[PDB]
Tab-separated table of C-alpha atoms in Angstrom:
chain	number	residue	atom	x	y	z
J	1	UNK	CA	166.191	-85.840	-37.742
J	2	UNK	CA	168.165	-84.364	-34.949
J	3	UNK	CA	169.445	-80.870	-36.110
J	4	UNK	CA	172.463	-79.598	-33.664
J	5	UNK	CA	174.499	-76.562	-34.268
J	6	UNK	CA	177.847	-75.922	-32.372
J	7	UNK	CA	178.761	-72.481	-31.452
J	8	UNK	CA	182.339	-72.057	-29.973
J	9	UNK	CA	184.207	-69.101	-28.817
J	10	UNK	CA	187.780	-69.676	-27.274
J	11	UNK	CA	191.041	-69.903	-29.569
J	12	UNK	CA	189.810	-71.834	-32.569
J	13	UNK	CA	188.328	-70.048	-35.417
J	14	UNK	CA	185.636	-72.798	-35.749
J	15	UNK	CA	184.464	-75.943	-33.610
J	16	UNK	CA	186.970	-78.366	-35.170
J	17	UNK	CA	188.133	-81.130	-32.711
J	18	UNK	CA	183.742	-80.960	-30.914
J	19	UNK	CA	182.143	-81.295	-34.654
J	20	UNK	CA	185.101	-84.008	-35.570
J	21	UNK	CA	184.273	-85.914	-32.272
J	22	UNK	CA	180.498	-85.664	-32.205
J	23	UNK	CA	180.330	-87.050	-36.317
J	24	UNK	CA	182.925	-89.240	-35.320
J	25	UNK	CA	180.605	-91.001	-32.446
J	26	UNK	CA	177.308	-90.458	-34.365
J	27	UNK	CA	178.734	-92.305	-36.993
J	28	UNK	CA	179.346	-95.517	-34.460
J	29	UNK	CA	176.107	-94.910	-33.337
J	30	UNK	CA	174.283	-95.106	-36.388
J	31	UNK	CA	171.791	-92.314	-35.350
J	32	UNK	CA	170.014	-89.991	-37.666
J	33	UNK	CA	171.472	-86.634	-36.693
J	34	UNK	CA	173.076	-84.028	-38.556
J	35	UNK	CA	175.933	-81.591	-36.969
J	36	UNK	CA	175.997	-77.897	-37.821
J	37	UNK	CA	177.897	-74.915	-37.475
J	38	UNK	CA	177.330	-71.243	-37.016
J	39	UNK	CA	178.828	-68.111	-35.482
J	40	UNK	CA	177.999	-66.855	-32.491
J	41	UNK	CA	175.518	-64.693	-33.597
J	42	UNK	CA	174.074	-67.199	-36.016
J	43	UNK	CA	172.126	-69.322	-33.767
J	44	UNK	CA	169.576	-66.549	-32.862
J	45	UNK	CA	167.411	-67.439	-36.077
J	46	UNK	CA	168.496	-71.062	-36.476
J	47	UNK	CA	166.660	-72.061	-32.715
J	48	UNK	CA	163.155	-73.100	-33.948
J	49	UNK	CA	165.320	-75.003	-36.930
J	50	UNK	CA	168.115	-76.500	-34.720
J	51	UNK	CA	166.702	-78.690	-31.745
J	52	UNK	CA	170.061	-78.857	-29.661
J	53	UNK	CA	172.739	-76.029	-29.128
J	54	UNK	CA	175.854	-76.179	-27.519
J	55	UNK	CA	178.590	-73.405	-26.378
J	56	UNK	CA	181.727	-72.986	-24.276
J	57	UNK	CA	180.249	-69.514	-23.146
J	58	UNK	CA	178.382	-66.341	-24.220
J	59	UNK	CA	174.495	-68.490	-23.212
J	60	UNK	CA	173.045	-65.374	-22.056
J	61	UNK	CA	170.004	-65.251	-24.028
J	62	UNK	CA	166.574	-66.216	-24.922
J	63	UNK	CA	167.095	-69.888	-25.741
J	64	UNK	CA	163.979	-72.430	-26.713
J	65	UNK	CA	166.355	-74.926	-25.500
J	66	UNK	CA	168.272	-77.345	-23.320
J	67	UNK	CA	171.766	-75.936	-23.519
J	68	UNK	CA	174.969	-77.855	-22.895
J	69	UNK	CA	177.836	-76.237	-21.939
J	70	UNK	CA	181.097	-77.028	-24.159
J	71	UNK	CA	183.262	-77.295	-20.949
J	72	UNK	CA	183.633	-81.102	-21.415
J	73	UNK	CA	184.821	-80.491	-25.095
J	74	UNK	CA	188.125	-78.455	-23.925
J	75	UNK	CA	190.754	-81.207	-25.239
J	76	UNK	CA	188.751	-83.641	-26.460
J	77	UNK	CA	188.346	-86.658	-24.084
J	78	UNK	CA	185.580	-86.427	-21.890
J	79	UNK	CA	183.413	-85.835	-25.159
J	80	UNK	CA	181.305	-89.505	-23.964
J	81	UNK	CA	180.335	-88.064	-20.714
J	82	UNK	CA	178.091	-84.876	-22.045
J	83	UNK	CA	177.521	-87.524	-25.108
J	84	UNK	CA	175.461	-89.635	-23.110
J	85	UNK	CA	173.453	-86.792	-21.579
J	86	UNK	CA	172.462	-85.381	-25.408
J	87	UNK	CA	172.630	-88.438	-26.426
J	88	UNK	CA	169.741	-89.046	-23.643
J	89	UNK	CA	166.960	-87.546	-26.180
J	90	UNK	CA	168.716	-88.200	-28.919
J	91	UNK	CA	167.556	-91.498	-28.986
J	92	UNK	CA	165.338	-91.002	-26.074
């Protein structure tokens, strides 16, 4: 189980169109992992938890882990691109 939290911080109140994509490609996939999503200041206590995190900005912390910037997930098309790299140890 793959636990992934999504943590955006632009115009959107929450990360609608990323969560929407990623479930949406899981799903073709077939891969046991489970999207979630937090605030901002939420994923502070949910690192040992979560095992992948991913933000359009505000990474200047302590992270346990392999951050992916949310650049890619602007509109919503080059969502396969940073796929593939997650996707990488997803199902390593």
């Amino acid at each position: 189980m793959k636990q992934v939290l999504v943590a955006c911080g632009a115009g959107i109140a929450t990360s609608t169109v990323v969560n929407n994509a990623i479930e949406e490609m899981a799903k073709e996939h077939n891969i046991k992992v489970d999207i979630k999503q937090i605030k901002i200041t939420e994923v502070g206590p949910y690192e040992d938890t979560a095992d992948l995190l991913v933000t359009t900005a505000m990474t200047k912390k302590e992270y346990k882990f392999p951050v992916i910037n949310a650049r890619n997930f602007l509109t919503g098309i080059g969502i396969e691109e940073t796929k593939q790299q997650i996707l990488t140890e997803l199902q390593k």
